[PDB]
Write an enzyme that holds these catalytic residues in place. Sequence first.
Site: not given
Lengths: 417, 416
Positions: B96, B125, B143, B145, B147, B227, B273
């Site tokens: 992000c 992580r 991910q 991912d 945005h 979320k 997200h």
Amino acid sequence: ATMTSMVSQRQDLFMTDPLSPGSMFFLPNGAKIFNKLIEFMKLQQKFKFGFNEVVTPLIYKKTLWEKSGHWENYADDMFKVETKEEYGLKPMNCPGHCLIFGKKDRSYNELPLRFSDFSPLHRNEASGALSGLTRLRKFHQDDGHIFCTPSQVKSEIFNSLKLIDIVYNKIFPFAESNYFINFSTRPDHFIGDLKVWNHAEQVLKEILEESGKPWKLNPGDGAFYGPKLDIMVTDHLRKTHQVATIQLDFQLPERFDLKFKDQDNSYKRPIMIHRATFGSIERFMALLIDSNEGRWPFWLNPYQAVIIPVNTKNVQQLDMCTALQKKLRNELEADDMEPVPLNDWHFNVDLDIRNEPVGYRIKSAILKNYSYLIIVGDEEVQLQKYNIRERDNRKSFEKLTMSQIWEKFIELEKNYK
Amino acid sequence: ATMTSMVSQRQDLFMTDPLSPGSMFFLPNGAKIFNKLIEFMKLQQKFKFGFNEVVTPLIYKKTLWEKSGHWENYADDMFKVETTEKEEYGLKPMNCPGHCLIFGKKDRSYNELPLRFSDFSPLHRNEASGALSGLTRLRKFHQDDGHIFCTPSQVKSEIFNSLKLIDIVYNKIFPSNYFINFSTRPDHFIGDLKVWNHAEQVLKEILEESGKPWKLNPGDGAFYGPKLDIMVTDHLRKTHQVATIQLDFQLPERFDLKFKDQDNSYKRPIMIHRATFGSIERFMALLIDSNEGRWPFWLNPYQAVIIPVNTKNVQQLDMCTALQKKLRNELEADDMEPVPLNDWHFNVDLDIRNEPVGYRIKSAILKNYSYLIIVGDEEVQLQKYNIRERDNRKSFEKLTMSQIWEKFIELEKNYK
Ligand SMILES: Nc1ncnc2c1ncn2[C@@H]1O[C@H](COS(=O)(=O)NC(=O)[C@@H](N)CO)[C@@H](O)[C@H]1O
Ligand SMILES: Nc1ncnc2c1ncn2[C@@H]1O[C@H](COS(=O)(=O)NC(=O)[C@@H](N)CO)[C@@H](O)[C@H]1O
Ligand SMILES: Nc1ncnc2c1ncn2[C@@H]1O[C@H](COS(=O)(=O)NC(=O)[C@@H](N)CO)[C@@H](O)[C@H]1O
Ligand SMILES: Nc1ncnc2c1ncn2[C@@H]1O[C@H](COS(=O)(=O)NC(=O)[C@@H](N)CO)[C@@H](O)[C@H]1O
Ligand SMILES: [Zn+2]
Ligand SMILES: [Zn+2]
């Protein structure tokens, strides 16, 4: 201002930011090329040169790097990770592939065993050394490691040279005089015994002479684990750059105690060959820009075609342009549930309907280096044919249909043109 | 977890090593499935849901992670890097903040919105050693991912479109199949409490208009926003968070993100997200947990196996090797002809082992080959191949080389 600055500005390729220096941002257009080069190399590696792609970790314990000798003999370039065990961010893939080899029992029947890896690598380069895409802190290699027997080495290196020839002589020419090889010998900081090293250099030199490739000695510039065959490409300022590389490794197999069951039912060390064809996707991409100045081939161009209506306010012209763009982009609606199928064709075609004169928009297109320019006036609307021309030849105008252009653009990608 | 470990050993999918706890190794067959899923998602993202893939750095200075707020909310669950001044870097746990930098590099108009960025970068992580579990919870993962930067008018439609993509994955291609966990404001959250309640109000309406099953999962939202967590169940009826839709009003303010509106006024874009697989790793772990190695044809690292009855019969081999050559569609390493784009290549193995034909069939049922192709003299006389499905014992059919070729393609052009 560097080797790729102007073109990156003009085509919106990459982006830098002082919050992660040495690492860089691939803007959507830049990422397309990045992914396309990788897609190309994957096809060659998987379906012609027998490589098996793996995905490896990035961080490993310090104990691993001490085996490989990276922790001592490559400490200047390695990032260290912390949270009482200390980790290292990988500058190379080789040790991880050694762990893969040593996980199972290996037969001589599995050899040559070829792994490929496109993992992002991190090397702590000096701030002064950093330059454009050629030298970065973060980059991706079309990396590959071959585990083989003494009788397989010569043929494996020749195969690696073949793929190199396809890339540097056939697909991306910059025959010969496209590259020469640096025979990089034992450095000052090396691991192993001189007996082993001298044998390694003999083998590599012998193969280098059979290839008949242009070469010169680059004394004391090999890797700490083995001597190299460095493919050297020269830029427009007559400066050489190391791209593809072939490295002969007798050291890491011993360091990791690798072994395979041979025909005599005994255990011997495998021979390890480090190799990459692009070297790094970033640097190779930087050298393409230095040569083409933004003039990409069709299959690689982020700006493949632009459709330009003569009168932007003419509805007839617009419908004709809108239709062709929809056809060539070949993209579904977010309304339904129909998924995008595999192996379908999608082209990066755009539509210039800025309220500017047609000549200005055409000049704008050639500046952005669109591979093709498609113009629609009244004569086109009447004929229901598009006036398509090539970027590098303003007398290549021809009138094709929606189908003809669709089939034309496909034959271009299936010919790597 | 141990079914994942079971299938992995059978098909040579993954591998671990104590030299990198929490990080997976993708062996050739395992990496194939990994790439296929990404290939599938990239197609839907680019050509149906208007996304634009970018490649962002993996390390950023400590400065950025403070500006985003990760350096205080995550610095335990975040790796630190040691550089040569002495500014410390952070190995990214999320994508992000890097995308905020992209949005705030060029001046932005309302014309560019909704602006969508996708990213498949590996994330790190530093999870607890006792939290680690197979492919479900890792220290390194990828991910799918995404945005989105939009205007308040567009949030509703944009979240729905994200659900439409979620409906495709979980209800059509990889099958209520899920319910949504409405995760609300965490204790350690950032920003004004006023905009939070607004975000949760808008998110609920969208969640209500949807018509999809949901429970409240209070206090388990992200520090930057509430979320919509999509939950899937095991055969042990345990839940896992895969897909997610997160509404961010904070990070755009943290990075001072602006865009020019139609009235020539500068406003803040809203960040959404989202991931559909969540992580490729965890998603894979739930397919294996469900199919037990019985992959669909388009995902199977073992698509077909050709079995000659007499492994010494020259004619049977000539016919078996011909089909394998055709199906694999490879090229020779001794010439300069490149592998072309958008051709077909199938994972077809050839069992010429000196064992009875029945033993070599048993050895393929357990490998979970999607198809078994068998050649005896009866087939050689016909020049047709005896092929059956995996999950149907009485599925045998006699096709030609061209027919199997087209049959396999059609299965892949349908995600079957
Ligand atoms: N800092 C860098 N930035 C961009 N590309 C680099 C960088 N360092 C090396 N490369 C590219 O990557 C290639 C491989 O680098 S190498 O060190 O010589 N070889 C290896 O690291 C081994 N892993 C090869 O398998 C180089 O030839 C060059 O093309
Ligand atoms: N291949 C090219 N390279 C550089 N500039 C070009 C090229 N082709 C066209 N231009 C420029 O684009 C503009 C258009 O030139 S033009 O040929 O006269 N234009 C046309 O023919 C059409 N607009 C008529 O329908 C001019 O500024 C010209 O110099
Ligand atoms: N340690 C992990 N191992 C494997 N998968 C994980 C892990 N942590 C999160 N995920 C997966 O990734 C998804 C996204 O994680 S998330 O924290 O909730 N979301 C984000 O981090 C935001 N960056 C998304 O844009 C999760 O729903 C889950 O499917
Ligand atoms: N779907 C299946 N599940 C479990 N076992 C199977 C399955 N299909 C075949 N087998 C096993 O594989 C072996 C071979 O079965 S078989 O059909 O009778 N074999 C033959 O017909 C061959 N000998 C002739 O072509 C048997 O042990 C059978 O039980
Ligand atoms: Zn290497
Ligand atoms: Zn996010």
